[PDB]
């Protein structure tokens, strides 16, 4: 269950990376990426 | 491509999919945080959950926002393409 939560967080980060690919593909928008990052990082942090 | 409306809408579709994917992941994580099938509150803390709920909601809004903007851009490119051909009747 602490295992489920780590697995989910791993999956969340794959999704985050998937999103970055699309953003790049959709070429001062480096802030979108940074803010996006922050929020995922917050989620990732709290779940380790 | 920021010139190709059919492509922007497609891109919008993708971000919509991303938004759905995050909402479903947030909902699974909620459940896991709560941690239920007697299990008392040894599970995930009240303040961390709030941070998470907020981070998830931000991500979903941003994703919705990119979708909306692409859709509006397409609409805008068509309206102007159409207005252009008219002026040249």
Numbering used by the authors:
A (entry chain A): 13 to 39, 49 to 69
B (entry chain B): 5 to 41, 46 to 97
Question: Could you share sentences copied from the article?
Answer:
Of particular interest are the Esx complexes which are dimers of two subunits (ESAT-6, early secreted antigen of 6 kDa; and CFP-10, culture filtrate protein of 10 kDa) and which are secreted across the cytoplasmic membrane by Type VII secretion (T7S) systems. Mycobacterial ESX secretion systems have been shown to be involved in a variety of physiological processes including conjugation in a non-pathogenic mycobacterium, iron and/or zinc acquisition by both pathogenic and non-pathogenic mycobacterial species, and virulence of pathogenic mycobacteria. The overall architecture of the complexes is similar to known Esx structures in that each heterodimer forms a four helix bundle with the CFP-10 and ESAT-6 subunit homologs each contributing an α-helical hairpin to the complex.
Using this expression approach we expressed and purified six Esx complexes and determined the crystal structures of M. abscessus EsxEF (EsxEFma), encoded by the MAB_3112 and MAB_3113 genes, M. smegmatis EsxGH (EsxGHms), encoded by the MSMEG_0620 and MSMEG_0621 genes, and M. tuberculosis EsxOP (EsxOPmt), encoded by the Rv2346c and Rv2347c genes, at resolutions of 1.96 Å, 2.70 Å, and 2.55 Å, respectively. The structures of these complexes were determined by single wavelength anomalous diffraction (EsxEFma and EsxGHms) and multiple wavelength anomalous diffraction (EsxOPmt) at resolutions of 3.0 Å, 2.70 Å, and 2.55 Å, respectively. Additional regions of disorder are found at the N- and C-termini of the complexes with the EsxFma and EsxOmt subunits having a substantial number of disordered residues at their C-termini. The average amount of buried surface area in the subunit interfaces varies considerably [EsxEFma, ∼1605 Å2; EsxGHms, ∼1555 Å2; EsxOPmt (form I), ∼1025 Å2; and EsxOPmt (form II), ∼1175 Å2] and the percentage of the surface of each subunit buried in the complex interface is also highly variable, from 13.5–33%, and is related to the degree to which the termini of the subunits are ordered and to the conformations that they adopt.
